[model samples]
Target: EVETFAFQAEIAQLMSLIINTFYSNKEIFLRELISNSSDALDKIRYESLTDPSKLDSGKELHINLIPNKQDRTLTIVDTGIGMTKADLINNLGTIAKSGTKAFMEALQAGADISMIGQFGVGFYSAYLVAEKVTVITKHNDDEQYAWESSAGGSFTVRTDTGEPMGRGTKVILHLKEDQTEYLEERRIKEIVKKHSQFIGYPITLFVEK
Candidate 1:
């Protein structure tokens, strides 16, 4: 079943703050998103140490960046610890209700993973360059779900049956017209190297020939 939820007033304000303040440094959205993927990958690795079954998919843990010029979109795929439907709602939705810093502090006490998301609102930074953001994710214990938003007043979440996802998340950014630089493979690589070169896992970008 599909469900829609409205963003708390503060989230809209936060979005405005980010888009305006980071307008000149919009490329950092890539770095933030990649850092998030790396955090997820790290989480699964840590969990699998205690429960080997968490690695049942046998998929190598890595992040993949795909830029589709024709579609004017960029997709970031991570074979990391994917989120359940509840996680999509709670993790993203709470940022709206509780504010960013508090939500991040909650995360710090809830998990043991070495997270790189200092602001917890890094996900919203996608709005700096994307008009729409879609996330398809699967957790080991939950069915696949899709979460979508337009950086507007509300967001939606629904069960996804598009592809057979082993376990992970795919975040697709429908880029804004003026932010076409993100669609370039070289540009993405540059951002990754500049900000996340030391991440433990591999972050690969597809190059169209």
Candidate 2:
């Protein structure tokens, strides 16, 4: 079953402001995505130790970067527990804060904004450079689904028929003309090392001919 939801108007405005001003570097997108993938791998590994069947599906936790120069497309694939449809919506659509309803209360209370990584908006950073982003994912509990969007305030999720990756998520980024540098294997590697060298998973790049 497919479903759709709209973002809170204020949240959408905040997203646009954050993307245009706060996020100054486009290369950081790769780093954030890789870091997130590493986190996913860690999650799967921890879960598998208690339930060996979790790994019985023949999927190992790893991140693969495929750069296609001809098409100017870069794909980041990870063999980790993929998100369900609801997971995608809830994780992608909204930003919620518990307590501290007043702005003054938040600042006066000395809450650390550094902990904002848990806010679940990291994936949306992909839209910064991608003209069209397609997420092909398969979850352990749900059938494979494809989430596609152009960062135009809405996204579409539907069942996929292509060959599945057993489990995990694959994000194919059709880079915008100005963001073509991301299609270079060396550039991507450099960015990964610069921003994500200490991340907990192996990141590999498949260079195109």
Candidate 3:
């Protein structure tokens, strides 16, 4: 069995700062997430074209957003290449790439690394407005898992309680009081148009009941 590593102290602090403060505009969060979904769709489409077996399961190319008023929740779902448990932890919890370490080193070396882009930390930006986040992911090669986390350091993972579903990912955000703007249908649609209109896959926004 392979062992997994957690993030370093400095790296965790850096990620927290970047996710919480680097973007002044909250609307950009939707853009970044949609862009990521678009990229996932592209990857699956490419794979399917070459190998029909890859298309056996999920749609692997759609994006959906739902805003709930009663619960103040915003849910984003994607039928794309779903992540495994290990992939979720590694991608969401730590910075394992040497490029990130090297970039930090350059900053300490006085190399003006301010322009260096963040690596492997974009998903955490959802926490800027979400008090709690729940990720439900079903991968073709693994069992479905529910990963829950708050803005704080600790997180929990367990087997999902719902019936088994197709392969994909769903992220549910419990919006903060001040982040109510994200719960409006018109607002979300406008942001989607501005950022994800050109994305090859269909993006749908589901209105709250």
Candidate 4:
């Protein structure tokens, strides 16, 4: 059931703004990522208030920042609420904006990137550096799914057969040639602290020795 589809036409203008703004403004990409992780972490916990058996309800909550220089990839893993097929196409398209923003209004608030829920207005900013973005996630309500896109005003959604996460998400960014700076260890530390210091959940960096 794996499929590839392009983005919507309106998404082109929005993606352009995200690319131009991040390139010119040098916003904290890592912070935006970490912020989304925290927001997602909160979501699962809240969902559990009604359903006590939610995955990881009794497990420790945390975020893992894994950097792989060999593959030029940056992955953010979270123990939080994942998404539904509807979420990928419409950014939840629900009242709860788990995301897609008001552009300036959102940046003024923060450059957040939630893993499963609210794919904010500023979410596509990842394309400012990555060649493509792959999101593998699972939810209690639906089968495991993966979403892939290169910011070309379209994306693909598939029912993944790989090992499911049970619950939560892992966002993998395939970096662009010129965007290697995101892989630097020192650089990651600076932004994570500067932008993510106040996040409610613990954000842990994962660099293989």
Candidate 5:
């Protein structure tokens, strides 16, 4: 089944701002995506401490980048704590109302949760470089689901029938023509090093011949 959800009022405002006039460097979008990936990675590791089964996806936690110049898309993948269908809707669609702030408060209260997205409105930055963004994610308890949006006014989430992702999330950015520099391996690595060198997880990029 497929469902389309409208962005919350404030979320709509935030998206429009980020897409049109928020970030100065469009490349900052990479840093934002990588940052979210790290948060997801951290979340899974923390979760596995108590519920060992949370590591069912295995312990090889890291971030992967694949820039397909031919497809004009840049994909950032993370072997991290993935999300369910409801998680996709509540977290991504209603971030402005409840997700980030509540997450931060819970984190500060020393709850087991640790998501940097709670403190950073970085996910929306994808709109700066992408005309459309697609997210395919799988949690331990739920089948894979795909979330897609063009930053128009709403997003769609549906069951993914493709190959098993096993676990974690993959975010694919359909890059705009002028944002194609991000498709270069060199440019991607430079941005990663400049902004995320000290990040805990390994950030791997696929280089083509």
Candidate 6:
């Protein structure tokens, strides 16, 4: 619960440090995101165990990959739990606190581990695949917000914009020049089924008819 801006700045710095060291290859971007989507699903499902109305909005808890070659965009969307404006503002920049890692032990073991501790390294890992990252998200209490940035730019945040997802998070990666292989259907399905099917949520490719 530190200042929101404080963590927003710290979040990116920590993430940059992590990827530069551990995920320099960048292919980990796909797996990191899927790990994140499943982590979000776990959150929503756990939330619903106590409050059925949490995910009562009729969206199934699934992950979707929508590749738009025209725009050079690969969108990773989750019909799982999402972040509110405050949630994003708070968590976006916050690194893993020593005590908080203990809390995640109860939530999900090794949930999206990042630099220092398991922070939003998953979301920040989007930097590996794209020049810009756009996140459109909706939560039960928080309506919706479209968050975007191009690494050096201020973490741009605007509320009440973009098409609604009803619930959960949608992250669009504006692909880097050499990273175009991510937009292929067979490749997408290959990575997903290979890396994340064990997470137990159906991953859908909204692509290649």
Question: CA shift at 166, candidate 3, in angstroms?
Answer: 0.3
lDDT of 5: 0.81
Q: Where does candidate 3 stray beyond 4 Å?
A: 1-11, 18-23, 93-120
RMSD of each: 5.3, 4.0, 4.3, 4.4, 5.8, 5.7
lDDT by residue (tens digit), candidate 2, 1-209: 55555655544543454346544466767876776677777777888889989887655678999988788789999988777877666543234322212322443467332222445445656767887888888777888888876655766788888887788888898998888988876788789878888877778889766
- For candidate 4, the per-residue lDDT at 10 reads 47
Off by over 4 Å in 2: 1-4, 22-24, 92-119
Candidate 6 off by > 4 Å: 1-9, 15-24, 93-120
Among the numbered candidates, top lDDT falls to 5
TM-score preference between candidates 2 and 5, better one? 5
Q: Which regions of candidate 5 deviate over 4 angstroms?
A: 98-119
> Which pairs clash in the backbone of model 1?
none
Model 5, 22-86: lDDT tens per residue?
Answer: 34567778887888888889989999999998887777999999989899999999989889888
Residue 38 of model 4: what lDDT? 76
The global Cα lDDT (0 to 1) of model 1 is 0.79
Q: What would the TM-scores of all predictions be?
A: 0.87, 0.82, 0.80, 0.82, 0.86, 0.78
lDDT of 6 by residue, 57-84 (tens): 7448888889999999999989878888
**Number of backbone collisions per candidate:** 0, 0, 0, 15, 0, 2
Ranking by TM-score: 1, 5, 2, 4, 3, 6
lDDT of 6 at 57: 71
lDDT of each: 0.79, 0.70, 0.70, 0.69, 0.81, 0.70
Which pairs, if any, clash in model 5?
A: none
Candidate 3 per-residue lDDT over residues 84-185, each given as its tens digit: 887777654335455466655765676432224344344656766778888888777778888877645556677787766586778888888989999998
**Residue pairs with backbone overlap in model 2:** none
